[PDB]
């Protein structure tokens, strides 16, 4: 539905601003879909206030889209994120790693596989280093070596870990020539600057829009997913971030017209970030899942599970031939 769109953008931009608030000058890279898919996957086993808090935390309105329509949209979306072309490599997976003896409801394992593509891996969490290596290899495999060490510390009393990964590699329509990549200034601010390899192309026709109102330019440099590059004027990053919303995102899309660009300069670079999202998810109202009042009895048939830690890691590579994105989310669950 259209109400799914309103939820997805609100959740993505809400999370983004919360990530920024923790360290307002640091690089940010993350996958909103990865995080919300792991939580939606968890909500398959939630009930009562634990369930409603999760789905509301994801910005869904339950009166507007039912729980079954949310899971349906995730299912449909996951199937589109496994594709291969000469121009695209997409992959996305879900998995649950479970204490070998822990009994799971048939409905939960069936739903998890049908809707989220998730198998169940018997794992010995008491052998903590081996369990960690098992999960980290699954993510490393899924993201083709790009996300390593997603899980650094794992409680040895862990009952299960729900994992999502996503991998996105895309060639530029018009690649940059590496002969035209040269060290150039990058201005952290008006008076702080470093030298970075700066790629360049001449005479590009690409979707373009100058927004003199918000003091920014947006362009598109590339399937069925758009990639927007939003370039605020100097000292206008904060102003631009202040206006991020569904509304202005839609306005950006409705205003992009093809246009010939004399020169385009874009840095060649790699950034990565990892986060613990407990604080942010509690701040978003997902709170009962973390306490002894958690109700995950849709997983096991008892209220014997609560979330302990949610971690997220993402990596972004920009180079002459295209871009590479990957991310993963792990939801760690303890006994109660």
């Amino acid at each position: 539905d259209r109400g799914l769109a309103s939820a997805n953008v609100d959740f993505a931009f809400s999370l983004y601003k919360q990530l920024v608030l923790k360290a307002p000058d640091k690089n940010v890279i993350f996958s909103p879909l990865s995080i919300s898919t792991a939580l939606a996957f968890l909500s398959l086993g939630a009930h009562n206030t634990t369930l409603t808090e999760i789905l509301k935390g994801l910005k869904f309105n339950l009166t507007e889209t039912s729980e079954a329509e949310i899971h349906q949209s995730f299912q449909h979306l996951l199937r589109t994120l496994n594709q291969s072309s000469d121009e695209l490599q997409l992959s996305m997976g879900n998995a649950m790693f479970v204490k070998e003896q822990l009994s799971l409801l048939d409905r939960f394992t069936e739903d998890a596989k049908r809707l989220y593509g998730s198998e169940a891996f018997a794992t010995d969490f008491q052998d903590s280093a081996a369990a960690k290596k098992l999960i980290n290899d699954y993510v490393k495999n899924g993201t083709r070596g790009k996300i390593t060490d997603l899980i650094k510390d794992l409680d040895s009393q862990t009952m299960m870990v729900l994992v999502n990964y996503i991998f996105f590699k895309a060639k530029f329509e018009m690649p940059f020539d590496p002969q035209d990549t040269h060290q150039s200034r990058f201005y952290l601010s008006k008076k702080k600057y470093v030298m970075v390899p700066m790629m360049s192309l001449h005479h590009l026709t690409i979707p373009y829009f100058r927004d003199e109102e918000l003091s920014c330019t947006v362009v598109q440099l590339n399937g069925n997913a758009s990639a927007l590059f939003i370039l605020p004027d100097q000292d206008k990053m904060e102003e631009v971030e202040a206006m991020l919303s569904q509304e202005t995102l839609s306005r950006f899309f409705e205003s992009l017209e093809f246009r010939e660009i004399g020169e385009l300069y874009l840095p060649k670079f790699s950034i990565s970030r990892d986060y613990n999202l407990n604080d942010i998810l509690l701040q978003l109202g997902i709170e009962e899942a973390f306490t002894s009042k958690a109700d995950l009895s849709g997983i096991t048939g008892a209220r014997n599970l609560a979330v302990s830690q949610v971690v997220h890691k993402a990596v972004l590579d920009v180079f002459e031939e295209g871009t590479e994105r990957s991310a993963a989310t792990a939801l760690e669950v303890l006994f109660q």
Partner: protein, 33 residues
């Protein structure tokens, strides 16, 4: 005769056309990290 120069902090967003699911989002304040 237009110049677009990513030599200062910028944003990138990957948006699904149909759901407006946001696959990836980033802010680049310093490519040299």
């Amino acid at each position: 005769r237009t110049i677009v120069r990513f030599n200062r902090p910028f944003l990138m967003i990957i948006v699904d056309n149909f759901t407006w699911s946001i696959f990836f989002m980033s802010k680049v304040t310093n490519p040299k990290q």
